[PDB]
């Protein structure tokens with residue numbers, strides 16, 4: 001996260017840290033005691049599927065304070081429409097091997113209904129993005145969880161107020177832009193998979209997933225987030241299904 | 255009705271035949287008698303921050 005602040009401990013209780021062989025991989029969002037939403041692209045280079053760990057209640061990576069809860073990831077479910085090495089349909093649904101225990105420091109973010117998300121949440125201007133990602137473009141990652149308030153843009157407006165670079169990916173109906181084009185504030189590498197959380201009438205909801213961008217907080221560019229509302233029905237159906245052998249599962253989309 | 259101001263619902267809104275609307279809540283919440291508000295039924299409802307709620 002570039003140009004944000006430290007998320008006070010316990011104020012981002014749905015934030016997940018994903019690790020592979022103990023190393024920082026990506027973020028994620030807890031949506032109930034056993035399911036985590038992340039980005040499909042976080043899994044493009046995984047060979048050690050058995051060494052994938054989700055950590056809940058994390059805040060400061062340098063100390064263990066007893067609020068952390070680690071769980072093995074039993075399954076990673078990706079839409080059939082996602083193509084490795086590309087940006088479209090950048091979503092993954094992760095089943096934890098054992099549920100996390102809800103506490104003051106571990107709380108799920110609400111996965112909203114599609115209609116509510118498209119009709120109401122999509123028009124809430126500001127939302128929070130968070131992660132232990134790079135603090136600067138080509139810079140060090142954060143030891144404490146960071147958070148940033150970003151405004152959402154209509155895709156027509158994002159394309160119009162964006163500087164053309166060439167070979168830049170298209171912004172599809174499965175994405176949205178959020179952030180600032182003045183090079184000050186954005187999510188960054190390492191924040192991928194983390195939540196874009198929207199407040200509405202006293203409750204927070206999952207509306208986006210940190211997905212991609214062209215350099216962190218670069219002038220004329222915004223952060224691009226997976227448009228979660230497109231996947232509600234897909235996610236709900238999978239959460240009602242029995243686990244299948246093998247960690248990776250490609251599930252038809254829609 | 256649901257299209258305009260979330261039909262007055264705090265959370266989810268369902269349109270019915272004619273001028274009929276039903277508000278609903280996420281799991282871990284129940285709908286109040288006002289027919290619009292959602293109240294937690296569990297200790298850790300989704301999308302609420304305990305250290306801020308307890309303040």
Ligand SMILES: COc1ccc(-c2ccc(C(=O)N[C@H](CO)C(C)(C)C)cc2C(=O)O)c(C(=O)Nc2ccc3c(N)nccc3c2)n1
Nearest residue numbers: 024041187188189190191192211212213214215216223224
């Ligand atoms: C889509 O496929 C992919 C595929 C791979 C990457 C990607 C490539 C490299 C790294 C990286 O350097 N990881 C490090 C460890 O190897 C780490 C975790 C920073 C310590 C991290 C990512 C990542 O997933 O965040 C990315 C990527 O950098 N994503 C993002 C996400 C949001 C951005 C944003 N909002 N602004 C600017 C750039 C942004 C880049 N996207």
Ligand SMILES: [Ca+2]
Nearest residue numbers: 060061063064
């Ligand atoms: Ca810690």
